[PDB]
Design a protein around this nucleic acid. Structure first.
Ligand SMILES: [Mg+2]
Ligand SMILES: [Mg+2]
Ligand SMILES: [Mg+2]
Ligand SMILES: [Mg+2]
Ligand SMILES: [Mg+2]
Ligand SMILES: [Mg+2]
Ligand SMILES: [Mg+2]
Ligand SMILES: [Mg+2]
Ligand SMILES: [Mg+2]
Ligand SMILES: [Mg+2]
Ligand SMILES: [Mg+2]
Ligand SMILES: [Mg+2]
Ligand SMILES: [Mg+2]
Ligand SMILES: [Mg+2]
Ligand SMILES: [Mg+2]
Ligand SMILES: [Mg+2]
Ligand SMILES: [Mg+2]
Ligand SMILES: [Mg+2]
Ligand SMILES: [Mg+2]
Ligand SMILES: [Mg+2]
Ligand SMILES: [Mg+2]
Ligand SMILES: [Mg+2]
Ligand SMILES: [Mg+2]
Ligand SMILES: [Mg+2]
Ligand SMILES: [Mg+2]
Ligand SMILES: [Mg+2]
Ligand SMILES: [Mg+2]
Ligand SMILES: [Mg+2]
Ligand SMILES: [Mg+2]
Ligand SMILES: [Mg+2]
Ligand SMILES: [Mg+2]
Ligand SMILES: [Mg+2]
Ligand SMILES: [Mg+2]
Ligand SMILES: [Mg+2]
Ligand SMILES: [Mg+2]
Ligand SMILES: [Mg+2]
Ligand SMILES: [Mg+2]
Ligand SMILES: [Mg+2]
Ligand SMILES: [Mg+2]
Ligand SMILES: [Mg+2]
Ligand SMILES: [Mg+2]
Ligand SMILES: [Mg+2]
Ligand SMILES: [Mg+2]
Ligand SMILES: [Mg+2]
Ligand SMILES: [Mg+2]
Ligand SMILES: [Mg+2]
Ligand SMILES: [Mg+2]
Ligand SMILES: [Mg+2]
Ligand SMILES: [Mg+2]
Ligand SMILES: [Mg+2]
Ligand SMILES: [Mg+2]
Ligand SMILES: [Mg+2]
Ligand SMILES: [Mg+2]
Ligand SMILES: [Mg+2]
Ligand SMILES: [Mg+2]
Ligand SMILES: [Mg+2]
Ligand SMILES: [Mg+2]
Ligand SMILES: [Mg+2]
Ligand SMILES: [Mg+2]
Ligand SMILES: [Mg+2]
Ligand SMILES: [Mg+2]
Ligand SMILES: [Mg+2]
Ligand SMILES: [Mg+2]
Ligand SMILES: [Mg+2]
Ligand SMILES: [Mg+2]
Ligand SMILES: [Mg+2]
Ligand SMILES: [Mg+2]
Ligand SMILES: [Mg+2]
Ligand SMILES: [Mg+2]
Lengths: 62, 207, 143, 122
RNA sequence: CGCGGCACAUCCACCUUGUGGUGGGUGUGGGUAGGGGAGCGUCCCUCAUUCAGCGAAGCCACCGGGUGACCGGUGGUGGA
RNA sequence: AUGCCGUGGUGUAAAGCGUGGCAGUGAGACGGCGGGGGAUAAGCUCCGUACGUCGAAAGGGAAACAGCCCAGAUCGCCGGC
RNA sequence: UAGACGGUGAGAGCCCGGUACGCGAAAACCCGGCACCUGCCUAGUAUCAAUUCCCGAGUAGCAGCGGGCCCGUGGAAUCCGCUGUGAAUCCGCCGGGACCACCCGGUAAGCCUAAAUACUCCUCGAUGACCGAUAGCGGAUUAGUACCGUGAGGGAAUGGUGAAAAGUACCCCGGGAGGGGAGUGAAAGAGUACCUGAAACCGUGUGCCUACAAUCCGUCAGAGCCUCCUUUUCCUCUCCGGAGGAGGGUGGUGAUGGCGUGCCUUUUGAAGAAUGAGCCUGCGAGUCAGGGACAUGUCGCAAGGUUAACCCGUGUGGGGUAGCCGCAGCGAAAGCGAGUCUGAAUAGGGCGACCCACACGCGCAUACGCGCGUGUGAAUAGUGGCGUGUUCUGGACCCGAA
């Protein structure tokens, strides 16, 4: 039986050209009036997955 | 590199050149071992079977009450710890055969035949029996003249029925077609005996 | 020769671990030890003890996927130069035969590496740098 | 293939039962009880092989003390005097001498007494 | 600490001077959960070889052996 | 006073750091010192302590006596300190 | 052309049934062929005309409520059901994922249709790195039997003398049962309680110890007895053999001295007065599947590696390029590409490519390199198979509820 991948994990993670796994950052969907532009700029963009969670994230993605 | 072609109840009548790329390949023991193992694995039937606790006859109801008895609770009478109960992790029908790549298979066969040729255990003959009537006596005499060892492999064309039947029932003689050569049979054989047409067909097939 | 002479390469075959067979090996708990969930079952990978998991507390990657995207099989002028030091007309089937590109696919030429041979290559959708390098070397880049 | 356990399984049973001969009760008859007694027996033997060195030294010291006090000196001062005289005769051989050659033991006592200092309390 | 046997690691020189062996120093060798390494014994198949109604297997006794799981020899019973 | 951060020397094989495979553990106990709760009682309860032992540590001492004192068992010896 | 298998007083190609190979069917049935027989064909072909008719109805469409499609009602197309309303016949109608226009495709609401696919109560012929009497079917034995239940149902246990009954004539003790002597048999150390014949368990004989002692039953120290062998001096009968004397060593026993809180599980901690175990023999728990996922060892080929289905072969062999992975990345995407995205930015950032232990010419600095042309040759790389560890979906290490 073919292995199945996790749907939410595939929707929330992706790999780069050399094999790193990147993600987007939370706290940036609503309630933006009180957040300074410095905070929102920090939350903007993509970032790599922590070395503590990389094993579980890899297992989810595979 | 050059073997002599012999005739039954006769003498030499030709010579056949063995190309180096087919009969001079170095012997790779590990590769030959892997290919031979895969062959013997594919040769298995794998028709063993047992019954699990779900497949043993009966055993549906809970035999008695859990509490107030003074005995172990049992759940079913076909639990594996019971006599006559099911088998745990027992044999089931299996398919033993591996996916050995063609390059490895061919390399192992070529190495086996190279070993045979290098040691000088390859013989070529025109035919096994003069006429169209098989004769095990004359065939056995011819092979005894050619060689004296217990195991012999005979490679003859699929259309040479008289030669096939003449050596069919000789002990220690194995027969196969040119396109069915393989490492296990070649390595089991002490000597390899080729018909001229079979040798040419094999060489032409392998270019 | 002689099937009783074949042996496997060293280190290719190791004995399996049989895990419930006494005290001199993985003893009785068979490497589990515990008394909890892991003593009898597996814990699902998605489970994090009850707090919102990593794959649920993080946002979905933004965007969409193009249903009609066209993909090209690319090759660099450096590769072309290495494969065809003699120059001459070069086509998609020649690229496939030389094995620098997949078959039954659109071919796009990119401009990485250096090119000295004069080649009149034909493909789809050249790059600007590749076109410049082709015309500088003296060949032609046609779709 | 199905393998019957009996041929392999009886070897350790035979060895344990042969080793447990001479025990009384279940301990020489049943394999399960002979196994526990074998565990205890071998632990006891290991412990006692180390302890018997101390026990034999104790016996030698007692016999040497008896001989010394027979020759009117304490074990204390006899050992101290032999060390002073530089005699490195063993305690085992000292006890053997005490039992076998009393004249030799007496000579050793005089040697140790001479080697002792003039006042042992200074 | 003394004398003798074993093992692991490291260092020093030889042998194919790391696949590993030869000799010599130095350190180390309690151990549950657990991790790594290497082995004993039972059965079946294949290849080679060898024993067997002048007695196989199995069982029983005795005498020995190995660092362990365990092994060998001799006799008795037995009958493939 | 200690403890903590950095730095220059000296010493020390089985320290440390990175990245992978495979874990177990996440009920601790008593003792010393510093505290809270309690009545400054508890073989009470909760914290700290490059503090110890037990857990997972046999041997000698404390009459007996997981947790106290000494001391960490490769094997043999009818040797010594 | 026969060395398959089995039997026969122990391993048989030449002893037997057989095997290779070759012959064989009254009749019946199946299949095929030929006739009889049956039925169809008995002028319409093309051209033109574009005026008319027909082209499957309570159907399609539409609305409501549902079902099902990757699609959980959603912007929801296509398909199916009930309710209501309800068309047109080619200038018709339906489809191409709401819908509209254009274009493309097709011709619903009638019916039939081989082969490639699925299965084995059953009948022949084979096979097994399957079981071998607690196994394998519940069932080698009277087996769905005995037995249990009102019933639906549940559901066992029990194989082996010997080559051949040659199955012990006869005599004796005995009511018999049973035994002894004879006898058969290679063997009764095969006697219808029968091949081999283990352990628990129960006797009989015998060596040692034990009735003033407080014992996890052992261990270390240790006298004394008993037994069997050897070195001495003695019976020198001595070819003896050894009584006997001493010594030494085997083996059995163990007066007496010290030390010593059973095993497992679970626990901070149990000899524990916490759990479990009367005893022996047999059985009883990390397995298998998948071109699954991750990591490793090893092997083949290598910028390539590899086939799936399937085809052909007595096989494990030969074909088979569809596909998969590698071969360039960045971006939500259009797209661009060794760069790309954000951005006004040729700013900075993120991700991705890019080598130097070096030389030579170029500008370079005292040197060190900074990009280029080559070597002083600066080293990459994947992929397929097979082992091992872990993991996924499966009953998934085994056992256990209400
Ligand atoms: Mg938003
Ligand atoms: Mg803002
Ligand atoms: Mg059932
Ligand atoms: Mg149930
Ligand atoms: Mg049954
Ligand atoms: Mg069964
Ligand atoms: Mg193939
Ligand atoms: Mg246990
Ligand atoms: Mg583990
Ligand atoms: Mg746990
Ligand atoms: Mg716990
Ligand atoms: Mg447990
Ligand atoms: Mg799941
Ligand atoms: Mg919550
Ligand atoms: Mg005794
Ligand atoms: Mg000591
Ligand atoms: Mg130590
Ligand atoms: Mg250790
Ligand atoms: Mg362990
Ligand atoms: Mg005989
Ligand atoms: Mg056997
Ligand atoms: Mg025997
Ligand atoms: Mg502080
Ligand atoms: Mg680690
Ligand atoms: Mg907790
Ligand atoms: Mg806690
Ligand atoms: Mg305090
Ligand atoms: Mg307090
Ligand atoms: Mg407390
Ligand atoms: Mg404390
Ligand atoms: Mg614990
Ligand atoms: Mg202690
Ligand atoms: Mg410690
Ligand atoms: Mg102590
Ligand atoms: Mg002293
Ligand atoms: Mg036969
Ligand atoms: Mg119609
Ligand atoms: Mg509708
Ligand atoms: Mg629906
Ligand atoms: Mg819908
Ligand atoms: Mg309608
Ligand atoms: Mg559309
Ligand atoms: Mg139909
Ligand atoms: Mg059909
Ligand atoms: Mg049965
Ligand atoms: Mg039996
Ligand atoms: Mg009835
Ligand atoms: Mg007779
Ligand atoms: Mg007999
Ligand atoms: Mg018999
Ligand atoms: Mg009986
Ligand atoms: Mg019998
Ligand atoms: Mg008395
Ligand atoms: Mg007392
Ligand atoms: Mg005692
Ligand atoms: Mg005591
Ligand atoms: Mg408790
Ligand atoms: Mg108890
Ligand atoms: Mg008790
Ligand atoms: Mg208790
Ligand atoms: Mg309890
Ligand atoms: Mg209780
Ligand atoms: Mg009980
Ligand atoms: Mg396997
Ligand atoms: Mg590999
Ligand atoms: Mg992308
Ligand atoms: Mg922005
Ligand atoms: Mg940039
Ligand atoms: Mg490789």
């Amino acid at each position: 039986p073919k292995a199945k991948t996790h749907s939410g994990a595939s929707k929330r993670f992706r790999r780069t050209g050399t094999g790193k796994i990147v993600r987007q950052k939370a706290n940036r969907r609503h309630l933006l009036e009180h957040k300074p532009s410095t905070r929102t700029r920090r939350l903007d963009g993509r970032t790599v997955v922590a070395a503590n969670d990389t094993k579980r994230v890899t297992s989810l993605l595979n | 590199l050059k073997i002599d072609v012999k005739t039954p109840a006769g003498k030499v009548d030709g010579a056949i050149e063995l190309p180096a790329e087919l009969f001079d390949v170095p012997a790779n023991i590990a590769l030959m071992h892997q290919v031979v193992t895969a062959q013997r694995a594919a040769a298995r039937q794998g028709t063993h079977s047992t019954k699990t606790r779900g497949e043993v006859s009966g055993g549906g109801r809970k035999p008695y009450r859990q509490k107030g008895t003074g005995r172990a609770r049992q759940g079913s009478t076909r639990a594996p710890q019971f006599t006559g109960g099911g088998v745990v992790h027992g044999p089931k029908p299996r398919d033993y055969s591996q996916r050995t790549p063609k390059k490895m298979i061919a390399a192992a066969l070529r190495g086996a035949l190279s070993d045979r040729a290098r040691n000088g255990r390859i013989h070529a003959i025109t035919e096994l029996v003069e006429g169209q009537n098989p004769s095990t006596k004359s065939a056995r005499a011819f092979l005894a003249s050619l060689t004296e060892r217990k195991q012999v492999l005979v490679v003859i064309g699929r259309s040479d029925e008289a030669g096939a039947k003449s050596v069919r029932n000789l002990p220690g003689v194995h027969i196969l077609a040119p396109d069915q050569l393989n490492t296990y049979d070649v390595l089991r054989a002490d000597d390899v005996v080729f018909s001229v047409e079979a040798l040419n067909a094999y060489i032409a097939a392998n270019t | 020769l002689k099937l009783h002479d074949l042996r496997p390469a060293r280190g290719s075959k190791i004995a399996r671990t049989r895990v419930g067979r006494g005290d001199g090996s993985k003893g009785k708990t068979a490497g589990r030890g515990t008394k909890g969930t892991r003593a009898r079952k597996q814990v699902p990978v998605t489970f994090e003890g009850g707090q919102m998991p990593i794959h649920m507390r993080l946002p979905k990657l933004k965007g969409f996927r193009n249903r009609f995207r066209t993909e090209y099989e690319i090759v660099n002028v450096g590769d072309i130069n290495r494969l065809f030091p003699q120059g001459g007309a070069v086509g998609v089937d020649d690229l496939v035969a030389k094995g620098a590109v997949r078959k039954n696919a659109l071919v796009k030429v990119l401009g990485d590496g250096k090119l000295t041979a004069k080649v009149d290559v034909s493909a789809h959708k050249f790059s600007g740098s590749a076109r410049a390098k082709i015309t500088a070397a003296g060949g032609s880049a046609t779709e | 293939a199905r393998v019957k356990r009996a041929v392999n399984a009886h070897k350790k049973r035979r060895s344990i039962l042969k080793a447990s001969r001479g025990y009384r009760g279940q301990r020489s008859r049943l394999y399960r009880k002979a196994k526990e007694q074998q565990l205890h027996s071998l632990n006891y033997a290991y412990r006692d092989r180390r302890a018997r060195k101390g026990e034999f030294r104790k016996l030698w010291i007692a016999r040497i003390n008896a001989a010394a006090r027979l020759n009117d000196i304490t074990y204390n001062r006899l050992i101290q005097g032999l060390k002073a005289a530089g005699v490195e005769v063993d305690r085992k051989n000292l006890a053997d001498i005490a039992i076998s050659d009393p004249a030799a033991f007496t000579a050793l006592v005089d040697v140790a007494r001479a080697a002792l200092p003039e006042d042992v309390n200074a």
